[PDB]
Tab-separated table of C-alpha atoms and ligand atoms in Angstrom:
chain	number	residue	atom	x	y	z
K	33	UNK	CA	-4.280	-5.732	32.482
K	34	UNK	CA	-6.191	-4.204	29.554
K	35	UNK	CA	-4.931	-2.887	26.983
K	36	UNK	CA	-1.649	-4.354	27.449
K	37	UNK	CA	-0.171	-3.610	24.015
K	38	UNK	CA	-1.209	0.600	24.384
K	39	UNK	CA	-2.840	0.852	21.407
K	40	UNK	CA	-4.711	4.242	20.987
K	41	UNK	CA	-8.907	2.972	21.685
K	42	UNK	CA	-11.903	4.295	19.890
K	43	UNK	CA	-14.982	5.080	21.606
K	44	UNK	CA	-18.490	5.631	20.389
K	45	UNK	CA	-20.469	6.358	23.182
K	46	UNK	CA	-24.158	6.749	23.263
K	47	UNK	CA	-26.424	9.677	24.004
K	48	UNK	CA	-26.649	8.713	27.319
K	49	UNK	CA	-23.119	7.894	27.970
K	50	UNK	CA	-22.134	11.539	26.889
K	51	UNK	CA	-24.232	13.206	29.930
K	52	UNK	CA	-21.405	12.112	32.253
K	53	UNK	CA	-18.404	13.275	31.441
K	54	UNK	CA	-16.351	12.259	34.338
K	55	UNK	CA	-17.867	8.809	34.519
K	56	UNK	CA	-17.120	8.317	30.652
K	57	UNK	CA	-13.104	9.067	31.070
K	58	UNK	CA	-12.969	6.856	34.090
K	59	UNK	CA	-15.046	4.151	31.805
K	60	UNK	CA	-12.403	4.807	28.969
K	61	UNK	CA	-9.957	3.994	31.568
K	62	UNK	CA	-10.914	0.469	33.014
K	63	UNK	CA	-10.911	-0.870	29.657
K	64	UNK	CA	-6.937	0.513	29.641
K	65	UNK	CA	-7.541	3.464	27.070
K	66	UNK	CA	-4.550	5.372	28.986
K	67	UNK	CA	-1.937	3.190	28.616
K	68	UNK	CA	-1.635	4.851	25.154
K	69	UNK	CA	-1.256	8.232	25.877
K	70	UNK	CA	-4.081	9.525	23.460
K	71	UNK	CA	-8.099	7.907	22.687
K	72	UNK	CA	-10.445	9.019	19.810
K	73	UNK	CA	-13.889	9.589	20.979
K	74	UNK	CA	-16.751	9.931	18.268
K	75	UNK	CA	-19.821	12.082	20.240
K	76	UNK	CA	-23.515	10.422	19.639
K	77	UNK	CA	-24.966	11.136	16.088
K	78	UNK	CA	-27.663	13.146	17.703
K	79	UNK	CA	-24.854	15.295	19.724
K	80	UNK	CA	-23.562	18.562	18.198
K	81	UNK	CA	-21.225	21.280	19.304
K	82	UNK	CA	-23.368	24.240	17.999
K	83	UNK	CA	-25.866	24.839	15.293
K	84	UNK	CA	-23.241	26.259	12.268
K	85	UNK	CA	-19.524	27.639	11.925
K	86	UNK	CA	-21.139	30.348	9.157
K	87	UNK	CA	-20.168	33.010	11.540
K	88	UNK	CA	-16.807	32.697	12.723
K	89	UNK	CA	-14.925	34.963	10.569
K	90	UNK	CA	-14.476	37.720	12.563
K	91	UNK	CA	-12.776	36.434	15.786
K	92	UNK	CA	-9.280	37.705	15.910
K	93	UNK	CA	-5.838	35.860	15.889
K	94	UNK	CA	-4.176	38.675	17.672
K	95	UNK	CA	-0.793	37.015	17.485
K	96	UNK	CA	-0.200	34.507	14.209
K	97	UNK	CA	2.850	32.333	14.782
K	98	UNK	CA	5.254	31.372	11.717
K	99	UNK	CA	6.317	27.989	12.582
K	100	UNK	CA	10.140	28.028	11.314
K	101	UNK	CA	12.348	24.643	11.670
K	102	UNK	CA	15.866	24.071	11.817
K	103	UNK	CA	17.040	20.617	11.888
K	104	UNK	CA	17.008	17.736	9.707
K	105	UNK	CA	13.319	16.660	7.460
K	106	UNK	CA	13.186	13.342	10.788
K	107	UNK	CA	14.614	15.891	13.446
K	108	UNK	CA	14.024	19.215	13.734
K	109	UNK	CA	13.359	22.024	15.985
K	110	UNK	CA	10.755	25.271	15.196
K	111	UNK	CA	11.049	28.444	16.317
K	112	UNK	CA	7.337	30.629	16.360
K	113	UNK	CA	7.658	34.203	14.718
K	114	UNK	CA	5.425	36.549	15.882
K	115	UNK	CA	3.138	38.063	12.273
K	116	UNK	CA	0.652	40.991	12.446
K	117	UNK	CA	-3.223	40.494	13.650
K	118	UNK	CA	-5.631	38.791	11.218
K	119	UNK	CA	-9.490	37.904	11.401
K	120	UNK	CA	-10.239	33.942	10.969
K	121	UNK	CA	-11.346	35.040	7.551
K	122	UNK	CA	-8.180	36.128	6.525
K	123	UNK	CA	-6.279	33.544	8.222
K	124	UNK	CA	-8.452	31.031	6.169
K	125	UNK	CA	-7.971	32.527	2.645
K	126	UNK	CA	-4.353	32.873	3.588
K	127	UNK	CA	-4.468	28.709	4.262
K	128	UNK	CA	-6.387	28.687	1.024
K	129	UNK	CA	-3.280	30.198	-0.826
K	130	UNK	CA	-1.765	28.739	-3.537
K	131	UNK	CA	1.840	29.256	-0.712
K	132	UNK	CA	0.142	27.885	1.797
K	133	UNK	CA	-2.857	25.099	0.623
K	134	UNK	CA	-2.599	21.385	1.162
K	135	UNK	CA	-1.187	19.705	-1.912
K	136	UNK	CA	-2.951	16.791	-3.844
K	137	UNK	CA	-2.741	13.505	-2.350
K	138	UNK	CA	-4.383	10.162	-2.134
K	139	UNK	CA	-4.952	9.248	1.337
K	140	UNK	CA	-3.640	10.573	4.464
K	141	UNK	CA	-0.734	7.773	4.684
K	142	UNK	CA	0.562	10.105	1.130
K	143	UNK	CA	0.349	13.005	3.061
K	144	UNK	CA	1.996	11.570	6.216
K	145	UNK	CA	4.622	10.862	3.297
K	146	UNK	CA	4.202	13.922	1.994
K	147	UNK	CA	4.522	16.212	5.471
K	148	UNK	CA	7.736	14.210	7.204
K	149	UNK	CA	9.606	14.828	3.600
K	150	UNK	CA	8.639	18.425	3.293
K	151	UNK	CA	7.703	20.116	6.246
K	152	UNK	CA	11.158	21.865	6.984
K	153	UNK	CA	11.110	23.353	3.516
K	154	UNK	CA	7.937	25.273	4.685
K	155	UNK	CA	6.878	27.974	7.828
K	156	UNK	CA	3.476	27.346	7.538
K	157	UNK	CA	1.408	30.200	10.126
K	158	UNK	CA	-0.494	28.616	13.109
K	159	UNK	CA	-3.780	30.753	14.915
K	160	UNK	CA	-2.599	28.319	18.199
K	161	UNK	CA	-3.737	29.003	22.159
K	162	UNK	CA	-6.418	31.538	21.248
K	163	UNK	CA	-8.348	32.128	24.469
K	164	UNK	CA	-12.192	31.353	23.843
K	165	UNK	CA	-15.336	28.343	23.321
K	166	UNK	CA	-17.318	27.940	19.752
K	167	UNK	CA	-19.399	25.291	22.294
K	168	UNK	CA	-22.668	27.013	22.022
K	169	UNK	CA	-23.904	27.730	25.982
K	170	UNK	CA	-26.994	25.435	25.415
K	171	UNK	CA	-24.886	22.212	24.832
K	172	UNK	CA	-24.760	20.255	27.819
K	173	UNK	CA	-22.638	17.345	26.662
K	174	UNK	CA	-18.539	17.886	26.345
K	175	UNK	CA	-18.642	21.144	26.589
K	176	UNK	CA	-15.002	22.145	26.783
K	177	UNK	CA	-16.057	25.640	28.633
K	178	UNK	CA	-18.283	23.848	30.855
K	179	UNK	CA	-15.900	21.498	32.355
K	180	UNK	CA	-15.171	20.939	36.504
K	181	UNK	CA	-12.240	23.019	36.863
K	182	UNK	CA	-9.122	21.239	37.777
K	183	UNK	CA	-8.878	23.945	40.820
K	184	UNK	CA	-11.873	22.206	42.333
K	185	UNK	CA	-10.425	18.483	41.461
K	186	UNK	CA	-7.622	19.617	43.506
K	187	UNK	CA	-9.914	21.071	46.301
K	188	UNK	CA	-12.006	18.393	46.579
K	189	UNK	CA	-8.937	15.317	46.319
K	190	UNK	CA	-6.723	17.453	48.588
K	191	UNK	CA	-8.773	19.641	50.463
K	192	UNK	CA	-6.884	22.944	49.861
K	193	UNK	CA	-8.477	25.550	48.349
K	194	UNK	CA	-6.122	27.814	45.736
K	195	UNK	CA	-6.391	30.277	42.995
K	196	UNK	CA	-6.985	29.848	39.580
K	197	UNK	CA	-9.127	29.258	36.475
K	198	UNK	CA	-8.941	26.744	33.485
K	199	UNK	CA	-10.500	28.351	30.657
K	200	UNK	CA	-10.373	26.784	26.617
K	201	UNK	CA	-8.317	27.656	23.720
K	202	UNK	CA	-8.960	27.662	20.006
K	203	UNK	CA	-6.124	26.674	17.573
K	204	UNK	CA	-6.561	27.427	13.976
K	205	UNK	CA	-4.453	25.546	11.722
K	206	UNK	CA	-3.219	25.023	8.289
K	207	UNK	CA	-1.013	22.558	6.109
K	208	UNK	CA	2.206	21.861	8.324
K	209	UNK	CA	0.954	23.361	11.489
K	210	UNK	CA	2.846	21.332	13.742
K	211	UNK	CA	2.388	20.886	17.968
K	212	UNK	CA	5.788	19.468	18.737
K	213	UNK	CA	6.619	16.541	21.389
K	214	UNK	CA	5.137	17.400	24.810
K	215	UNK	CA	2.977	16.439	27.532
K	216	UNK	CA	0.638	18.782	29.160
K	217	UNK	CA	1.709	21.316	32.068
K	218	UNK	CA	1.743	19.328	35.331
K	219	UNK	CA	1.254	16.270	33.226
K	220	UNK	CA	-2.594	16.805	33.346
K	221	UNK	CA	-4.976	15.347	30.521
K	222	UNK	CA	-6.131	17.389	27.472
K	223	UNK	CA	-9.408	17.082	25.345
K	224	UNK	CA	-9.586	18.521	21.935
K	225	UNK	CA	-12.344	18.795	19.658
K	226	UNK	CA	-12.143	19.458	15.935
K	227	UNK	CA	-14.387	22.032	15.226
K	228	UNK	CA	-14.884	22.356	11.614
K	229	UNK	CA	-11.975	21.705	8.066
K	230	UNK	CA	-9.033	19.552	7.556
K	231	UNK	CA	-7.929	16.915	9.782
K	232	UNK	CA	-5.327	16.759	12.386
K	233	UNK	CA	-2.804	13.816	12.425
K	234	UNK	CA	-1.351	12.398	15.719
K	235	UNK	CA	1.269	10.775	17.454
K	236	UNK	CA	1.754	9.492	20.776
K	237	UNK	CA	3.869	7.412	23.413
K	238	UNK	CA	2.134	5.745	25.896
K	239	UNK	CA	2.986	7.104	29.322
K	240	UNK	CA	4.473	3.796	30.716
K	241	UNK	CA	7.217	4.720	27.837
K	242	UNK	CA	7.766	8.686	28.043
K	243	UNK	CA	11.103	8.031	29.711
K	244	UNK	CA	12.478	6.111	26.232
K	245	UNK	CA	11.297	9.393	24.160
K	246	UNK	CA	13.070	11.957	26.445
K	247	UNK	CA	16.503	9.855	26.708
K	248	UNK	CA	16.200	9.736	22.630
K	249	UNK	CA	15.059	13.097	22.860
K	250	UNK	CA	18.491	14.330	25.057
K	251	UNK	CA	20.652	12.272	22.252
K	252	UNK	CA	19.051	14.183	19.276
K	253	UNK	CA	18.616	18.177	20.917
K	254	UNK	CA	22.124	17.916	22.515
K	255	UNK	CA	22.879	21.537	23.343
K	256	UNK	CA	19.130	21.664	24.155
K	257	UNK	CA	19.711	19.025	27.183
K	258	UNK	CA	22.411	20.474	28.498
K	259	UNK	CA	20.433	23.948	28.594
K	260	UNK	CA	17.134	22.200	30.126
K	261	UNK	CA	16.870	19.223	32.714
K	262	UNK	CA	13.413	18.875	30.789
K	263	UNK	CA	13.443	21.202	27.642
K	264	UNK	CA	10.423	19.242	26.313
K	265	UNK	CA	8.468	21.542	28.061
K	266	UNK	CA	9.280	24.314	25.476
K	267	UNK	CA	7.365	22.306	22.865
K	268	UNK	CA	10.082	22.673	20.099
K	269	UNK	CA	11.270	19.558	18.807
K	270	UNK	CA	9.823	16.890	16.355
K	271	UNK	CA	10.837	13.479	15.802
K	272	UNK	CA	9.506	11.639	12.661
K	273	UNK	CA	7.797	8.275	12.849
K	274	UNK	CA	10.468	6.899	10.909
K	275	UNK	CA	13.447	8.031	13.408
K	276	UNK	CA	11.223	6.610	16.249
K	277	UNK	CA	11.007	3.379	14.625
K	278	UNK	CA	14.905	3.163	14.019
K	279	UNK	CA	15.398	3.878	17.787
K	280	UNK	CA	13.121	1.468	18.663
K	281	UNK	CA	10.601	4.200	20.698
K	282	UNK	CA	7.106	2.741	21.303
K	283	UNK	CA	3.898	4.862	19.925
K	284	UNK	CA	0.938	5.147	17.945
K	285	UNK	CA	-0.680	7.511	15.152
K	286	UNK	CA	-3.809	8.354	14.437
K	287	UNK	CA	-5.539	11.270	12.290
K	288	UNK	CA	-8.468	13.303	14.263
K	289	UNK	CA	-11.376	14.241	11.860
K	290	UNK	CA	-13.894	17.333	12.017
K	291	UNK	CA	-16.721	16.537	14.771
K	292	UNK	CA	-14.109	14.187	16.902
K	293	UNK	CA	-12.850	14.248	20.157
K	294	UNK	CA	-9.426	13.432	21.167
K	295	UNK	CA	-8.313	12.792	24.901
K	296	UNK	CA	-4.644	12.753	25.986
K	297	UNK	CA	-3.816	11.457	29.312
K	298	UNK	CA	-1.071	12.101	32.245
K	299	UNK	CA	2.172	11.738	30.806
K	300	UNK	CA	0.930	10.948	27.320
K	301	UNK	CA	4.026	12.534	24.736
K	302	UNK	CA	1.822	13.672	21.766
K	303	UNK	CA	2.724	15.575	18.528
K	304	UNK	CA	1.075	15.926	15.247
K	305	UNK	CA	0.161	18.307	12.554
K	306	UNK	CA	-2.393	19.497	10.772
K	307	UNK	CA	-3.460	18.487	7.219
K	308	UNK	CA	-5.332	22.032	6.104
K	309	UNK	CA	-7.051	24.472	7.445
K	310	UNK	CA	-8.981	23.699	10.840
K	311	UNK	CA	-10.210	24.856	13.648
K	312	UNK	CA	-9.777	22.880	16.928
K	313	UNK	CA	-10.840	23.522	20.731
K	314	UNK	CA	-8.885	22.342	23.642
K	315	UNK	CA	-8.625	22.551	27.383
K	316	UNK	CA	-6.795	20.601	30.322
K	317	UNK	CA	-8.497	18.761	32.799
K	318	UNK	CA	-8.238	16.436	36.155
K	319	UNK	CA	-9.026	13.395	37.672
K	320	UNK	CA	-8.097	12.107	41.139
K	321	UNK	CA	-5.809	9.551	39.313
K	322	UNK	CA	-3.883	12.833	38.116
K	323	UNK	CA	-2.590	13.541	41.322
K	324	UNK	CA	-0.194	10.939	41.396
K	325	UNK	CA	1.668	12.408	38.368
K	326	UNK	CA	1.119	16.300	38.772
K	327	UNK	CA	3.206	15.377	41.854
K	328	UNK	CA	5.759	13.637	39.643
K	329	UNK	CA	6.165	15.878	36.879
K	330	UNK	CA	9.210	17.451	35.453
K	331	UNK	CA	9.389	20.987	35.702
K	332	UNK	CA	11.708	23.731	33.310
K	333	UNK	CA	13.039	26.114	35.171
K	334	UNK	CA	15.941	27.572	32.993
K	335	UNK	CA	13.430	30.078	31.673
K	336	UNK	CA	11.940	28.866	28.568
K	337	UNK	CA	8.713	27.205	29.022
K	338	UNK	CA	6.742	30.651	30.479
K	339	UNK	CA	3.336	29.693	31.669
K	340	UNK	CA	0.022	30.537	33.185
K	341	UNK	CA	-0.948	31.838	36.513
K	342	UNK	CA	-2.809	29.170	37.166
K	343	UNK	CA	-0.112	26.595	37.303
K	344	UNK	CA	1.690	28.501	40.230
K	345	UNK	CA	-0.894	26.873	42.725
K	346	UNK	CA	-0.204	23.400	41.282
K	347	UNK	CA	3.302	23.566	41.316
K	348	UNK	CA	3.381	24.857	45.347
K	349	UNK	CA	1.086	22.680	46.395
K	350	UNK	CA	2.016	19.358	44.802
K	351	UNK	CA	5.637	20.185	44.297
K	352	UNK	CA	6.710	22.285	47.311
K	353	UNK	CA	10.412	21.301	47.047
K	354	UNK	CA	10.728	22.494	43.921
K	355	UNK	CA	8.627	25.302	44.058
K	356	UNK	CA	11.137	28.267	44.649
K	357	UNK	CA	13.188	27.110	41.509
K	358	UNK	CA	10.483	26.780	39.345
K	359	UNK	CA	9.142	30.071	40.430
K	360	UNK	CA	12.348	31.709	39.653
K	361	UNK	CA	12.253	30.470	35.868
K	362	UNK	CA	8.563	32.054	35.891
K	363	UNK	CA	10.651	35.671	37.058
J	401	OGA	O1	-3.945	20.963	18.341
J	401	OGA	C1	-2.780	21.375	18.688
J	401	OGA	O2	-2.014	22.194	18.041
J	401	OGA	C2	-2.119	20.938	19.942
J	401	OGA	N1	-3.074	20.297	20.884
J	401	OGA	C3	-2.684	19.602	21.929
J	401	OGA	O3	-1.447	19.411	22.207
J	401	OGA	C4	-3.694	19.062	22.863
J	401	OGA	O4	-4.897	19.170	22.592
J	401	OGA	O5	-3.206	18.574	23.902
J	402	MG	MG1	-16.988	36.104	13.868
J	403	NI	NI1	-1.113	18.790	24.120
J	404	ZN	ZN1	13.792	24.911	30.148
């Protein structure tokens, strides 16, 4: 078996590795890059995303989100607070602030240090799940908005045709932005790209593991379990490193630099925050070995987790039985 400790692989793949997109995930695969939950891919040196960020300014972050815990510094909960409209230009000089800027450091292990001590003291704002691409339409490689849709993976593994569209989001971030513990809807994969700024650190359980995160997970959100059968899926609670390590959870870390890809895979528990300001890009995505757990995934239905349209045709198709509940917690 590769990979048999789950440790999170880095891939440099050459120009003419990145043409195939499909065939480089299922590449990243035989040599066991999934059993971590999360991979690091570095595009080709002669690869870019699009010529310059100079012009960015002036897309809109229609709905800022104050990110405000509750909890303990190790475990902790956030609640998002809805702020007015800003431009990306204002959202950056408001990162900039002397409230809101990264603090001096030495290394990103200090600010690791620095973030699990801190954090709660803090609502930093977060420009997250912005609907949009900064992939410029003539790059052919890893283009997030260019990607098979996972409609058609579905289609063509299943043969059932259904509704739906998978279209990228843009997150723009500052110091303590924070994506709490989750995996993706319907347990799919997700690829993000770091755009342009500060860098984005990571955590994440390998998938053969996820059960051992969301028992520890019902012993430290009590009321939360008995609320939700799976209230992971309303992506509010973080658990430090240094709590997982005293419960003995399995993961990794990593920190995701500008220009970098990062994959997550089926099942893959992921959380992580962000060290400045940044922009990122990210989108879900399918393979047939998805099926298997898209058919297996837990689903909220108390009411909480609200999402797209699109995941309406996954859940009735894969997940007939538990289709009418789910439904009803989308109504
Ligand atoms: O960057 C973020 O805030 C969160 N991103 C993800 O969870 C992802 O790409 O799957
Ligand atoms: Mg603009
Ligand atoms: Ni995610
Ligand atoms: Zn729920």
């Amino acid at each position: 078996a590769q990979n048999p400790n789950c440790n999170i692989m880095i891939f440099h793949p050459t120009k003419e590795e990145f043409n195939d997109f499909d065939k480089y995930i299922a590449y990243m695969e035989s040599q066991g890059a999934h059993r971590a939950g999360l991979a690091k891919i570095i595009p080709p040196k002669e690869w870019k995303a699009r010529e310059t960020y100079d012009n960015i300014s002036e897309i809109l972050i229609a709905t800022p989100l104050q990110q405000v815990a509750s909890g303990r510094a190790g475990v902790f909960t956030q609640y998002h607070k809805k702020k007015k409209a800003m431009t990306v230009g204002e959202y950056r000089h408001l990162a900039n602030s002397k409230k809101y800027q990264t603090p001096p450091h030495q290394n990103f292990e200090d600010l690791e240090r620095k973030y699990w001590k801190n954090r709660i003291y803090n609502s930093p704002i977060y420009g997250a799940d912005i609907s949009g691409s900064l992939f410029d339409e003539n790059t052919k490689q890893w283009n997030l908005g260019h990607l098979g849709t996972i409609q058609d993976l579905l289609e063509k593994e299943c043969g059932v045709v259904i509704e739906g569209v998978n279209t990228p989001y843009l997150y723009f971030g500052m110091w303590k932005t924070t994506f709490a513990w989750h995996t993706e809807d319907m347990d799919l994969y997700s690829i993000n790209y770091l755009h342009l700024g500060e860098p984005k650190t990571w955590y994440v359980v390998p998938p053969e593991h996820g059960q051992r995160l969301e028992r520890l997970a019902r012993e430290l959100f009590p009321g939360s379990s008995r609320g939700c059968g799976a209230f992971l899926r309303h992506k509010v609670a973080l658990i430090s490193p240094t709590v997982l390590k005293e419960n003995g959870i399995p993961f990794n870390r990593i920190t995701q630099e500008a220009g970098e890809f990062m994959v997550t895979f089926p099942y893959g528990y992921h959380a992580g925050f962000n060290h400045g300001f940044n922009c990122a890009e990210a989108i879900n995505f399918a393979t047939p070995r998805w099926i298997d757990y898209g058919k297996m995934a837990s689903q909220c239905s108390c009411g909480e987790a609200r999402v797209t349209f699109s995941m309406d045709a996954f859940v009735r198709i894969l997940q007939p039985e538990r289709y009418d509940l789910w439904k009803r917690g989308q109504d």
